[PDB]
């Protein structure tokens, strides 16, 4: 079914560091999902609260 | 105390932390049981039929509020009273609710945000999210201001939003939800013309004070709901009552018996310990324009600089460096030789490997040794990477003290996570002052569990956190324990200088149990466990004392030209005699350096008249 | 441009200067053509048939007001808006009108204060002053403060020969004269419980701002009648806008664009040059004892001492210094060449003779050497003679700085008049800062005509004056003229040591 | 008949300096009469403005 997300547009590829990228269409913005144990708007900071 | 427990607020613009079930957890443990969330209120990625009855208490949000991609039908975010909007999502809006529906078209249903009254800054954006009902008829000019009212972009359209109409007891059919309760409590367009701020009822007789923000319970600065600028023991003042009042009948500054210190939107009797106390009575975190700080008997002030004073750089995320989020090889040409970083230090594994997303070159791993000059760090120190050669933290060799004013994630001032370094090597590190320390996720790093961090901290209440690094039972196997000299007070590493207090004698930094004295070849002497070098002009002793002073005047045993009490390699060869005359001293019957008859004003270099040609 | 001319206001409580014509003729100079009185208001002994035209323009008296022992038809003290009450009379009163009748019982029949709104401090006492009426029924709670209502007493009484009533239209006949124009404007009791300060009209849609002290002209922080506390450019503020604003998010302090240096109940863009600015902009006269006055970058400052602060001597007239008016023989010991006299130097021909009514022994002249090298005096110097053997100002020798904080009579700093001293001296005084220097009453004193005071004080806008001294042709062929080898710079004395 | 001015009570003998002292009956407080060229509460200062 039609979802929000199309694959990362390669305009902002390798956008985040510790996570997988995905581009949503409901605003034309990239918003990636981090790996486990990370935070941040670019999945850059390490989760220290564990 | 009586105050309200605070969260720290998320800062994930649009980001899924793991999966729909892991993300829901990073919400819960972050936003459970708190009332004054201090950074933001992202409620994002909740999925259908996930309980959210813990948002019934957030009574302030000192930052924007993002509700985006939420599929639960009901978000109980009711008791929220004011969104101070210190920082805007999308750099304009301060309450965004956008695209809250899945593929099946069953997205957000109702936002019973009843008691939301005032937004101190910023517009409000809304976007496609059907099943959202009743909010399409709220009155905005009451909630928001008037100038910022030209940026909002609300856009309501729903299909299954068959939600019933709101009860007729409330104006213009304006309502958050359904029932008599959910209907827009008006307090800023029903005011009487003579009123300037908040009110209640068109009666010009029961307005609110000038500083209340939501509402009031009587016109008074003591009966507001939420204060607009400052507050001191239930009083929404506009500026903390200063310390010294002016007396125009005598022109001399009096003393205010109610002088309080303005510390970040509250008036306090005394600033905290690690905070500067300036002259205006306002607690600061970093006060340098031309001047610098210095100790004043337990309370740090920052007096004036005498022209040329030492350098200071700006931290990460402050002033210049804000579009950058680490220290990469385009914002390192600033930390050239500054000895104190006003701010905070990030080292993420983006600088070394570089990245093209923000136009950063791949920083050479050697440029990092510039930071050898850093001594005091105001904020926190976060490290999660290091060049793939170094074995101990080298560039931070002589870090004196970590002030820890602003702490990463709210508790961690020092944080070294996911590193490959045999052992720390931070050897100076006097007095980590506030905030906790986390050193984990390290592959091969073991010594650090030996130090006594209970003494290293500053303000008590701290707590260390050291797990998930190379086991002690594996470093003792390879014998990676510290030098036998170091006292039972810790050892940052295996090199015999990494101790913190040597066994018996110390060479300033390097440890030696028995330095050289009455037996021993190098000429030096001990002084309160410090091996200091006496003047080398003396002769190597074997029986009695060498000396007790740095100068040679105590070199008793000497095999050179003995300058009376002193002893030098040759008797003085250019010292001035009387009345600014150059005089070469000669040797007496004991080879001593002594003067002669004042007759021969050009010195006395001979026995009698054989050195003054007659 | 919107400023108002200012009077200084006398302080001679009940004494009369000379005769009833001279007294009045001095009372014609002081108070002629001015709105605000920066001092006190004494009007006493203006006898009958004398005119009081000028006395209507007075708009505010920043002290107390005394109307006693005068017998005249009326006192057209009409537009007096407010009486601050900074000082007081009898330590409790701010307006007192006592005993306005002579033998003829003609007295004062009408005190027309139509629009006196508020007395900011202290009680008010109308002692027995017959032949006065139409001021015997005003409601006083409207003008006096709340607590000071207990500290007052009215002794109004009159034989009441005529004294008609006024128009019954104005509230409870509480008028100060004839008609409604001369009737009270009571704007503190007829207000709504929704207003806390003054108001105008019973309605709560127009009640005055919480800072205006008399009335209002469209409720706002500006447009008051008289500012109660401070004033910054036609706005009755409560504290001048500071220069540094504590940004409660970044914990720093920001430069405020509207910086206002507080300066004695008015906010000004920059303190006067001879004033020492503290850290947060506010003019002050003498920095606190913890600090020492250091000058840097033009205008002066004051920072903490290096331990043992130098001794400062506060002049007579401030602090505990009111049980004595000049430096009598019970205070000289409290001076040890401070070099930094702060404010006054009150040395009058009254110490040397002593007086018993004030419980003082006669001063001996030998102990006037403590002031041998007083380097700087901030405010002003008041001398009128010496012990008549010393033939020059021998104590004040190394004095150099006269800055002018508390100028005498608001117009004078170096006051040396009425002595018999051949050459005054002052071999080292080179730093007059403000005020005026006056040497006009010495029978035998003929060197002060030579100095070019233009270089004595900067801050152009001052003018000295020298009269009634030995004519230049008198002491020319006498032995007292500027020295021969001396330089064309003036002769503070006859010799080369003072050629400067 | 009401001699509003009576002579200085001699309890304040030479109360003021530069002018005759004289007392009052209705208020019981003296009002010195300063000479010409003198001002002040007890005739202290020389009139410097004049």
Residue numbers in the entry:
A (entry chain C), D (entry chain D): 1 to 50
B (entry chain A): 1 to 614
C (entry chain B): 1 to 500
Paper text:
The epidermal growth factor receptor (EGFR) is a receptor tyrosine kinase that couples the binding of extracellular ligands, such as EGF and transforming growth factor-α (TGF-α), to the initiation of intracellular signaling pathways. The extracellular module of EGFR consists of four domains, denoted Domains I, II, III, and IV. Domain II, which bridges the ligand-binding domains, contains the ‘dimerization arm’, a loop that mediates the principal interaction with the other subunit in an activated dimer. Domains I, II, and III form a compact unit that we refer to as the ligand-binding ‘head’, and Domain IV forms a rigid and elongated ‘leg’ that connects the ligand-binding head to the single transmembrane helix.
